Design a protein around this ligand. Structure first.
Ligand SMILES: *[PH](O)(O)OCC(C)(C)[C@H](O)C(=O)NCCC(=O)NCCSCCC(=O)CCCC(C)=O
Length: 86
């Protein structure tokens, strides 16, 4: 019932927020990899965040989206706010 955002969910959703950036690798452990390695833009991540905010019912300050380095931190932001909604 509580749709805790997993690595597999993120692997989908992250791609769902990238349009022209198709063809990266998000399958060979991207969780500790950096957004620069996975070819993610700055705006793309704001967008990724907003996507997740609106779907899961959370919120993340847009600057904090640019403060993350690795996807696990972004993921932490989501599930963190999600766990506050409980
Ligand atoms: P990232 O690490 O490249 O950082 C991006 C950003 C926007 C957080 C940062 O503040 C920045 O790029 N600052 C430079 C000054 C500036 O005004 N940048 C704008 C760049 S993109 C879009 C700006 C905007 O006002 C509206 C965009 C609306 C859309 C894309 O729909």
């Amino acid at each position: 019932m509580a749709t805790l955002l997993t690595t597999d969910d993120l692997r989908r959703a992250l791609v769902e927020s990238a349009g022209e950036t198709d063809g990266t690798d998000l399958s060979g452990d991207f969780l500790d990899l950096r957004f620069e390695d996975i070819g993610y833009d700055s705006l793309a991540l704001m967008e990724t965040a907003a996507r997740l905010e609106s779907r899961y019912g959370v919120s993340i300050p847009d600057d904090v989206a640019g403060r993350v380095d690795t996807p696990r931190e972004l993921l932490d932001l989501i599930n963190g706010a999600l766990a506050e909604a409980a």
